[PDB]
Amino acid sequence: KKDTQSITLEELAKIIKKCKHVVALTGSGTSAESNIPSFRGSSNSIWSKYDPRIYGTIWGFWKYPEKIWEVIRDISSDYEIEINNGHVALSTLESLGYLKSVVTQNVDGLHEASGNTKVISLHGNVFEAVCCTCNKIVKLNKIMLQKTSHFMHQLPPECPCGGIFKPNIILFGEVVSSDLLKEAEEEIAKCDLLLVIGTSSTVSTATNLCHFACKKKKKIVEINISKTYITNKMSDYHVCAKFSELTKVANILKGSSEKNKKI
């Protein structure tokens, strides 16, 4: 419980200029302008064909294991999914020596695709699959998630051993890997600014990490299109902005990096 202040992007550029070890905590809002809706209750979207009480939960996987595959398949097949300007900005911010890692709840792989080098995926990742009898791992790529791939032909996909593949993502009701959390915790432990970008409503995961960042008396900035659970509880500043307006921050920091010519 505490008093959050509104700041501009220009002003965030200045906060980041002083900093040696910035961390970004990212939620679905950073994939929205890549064409995947965060609302999730929108009817202008995919989440609509499918009951989130079934595909979203581990009870739902064991009863209807085809359903989370259908959802991943239709999102991959039916939408143009590309790195946006926000992802490019974060990649620059790493390049310039500011951003040390990204802790994320998205499962879509975009931060890596943009060139980030230390992405901690707390909810896992849609490009691997595990057999939930023998634990054989299978690596996948975008092209294998298409509706026409052999791997999608019969759902849920089947291991040679006779078991069934499960995506390697953490569903509601499951437990986030303690190792991955300790990783995220230590990256926060050493940081001097946490950027919390595109997150809600929340989920226990991001929240617990912000609590941890307060415990460690760390400086927190939200970049969001709106107030969130942690505004006025845990964030020190808040920037009202879309993930991709972040290239303005990257611009200000790159051109100041051109204090580079002699004299």
Binding site: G173, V175, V176, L181, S200, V203
Partner: peptide, 7 residues
């Protein structure tokens, strides 16, 4: 227990 849960 760090269960993924709805906030």
């Amino acid at each position: 227990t760090a269960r993924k849960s709805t906030g």
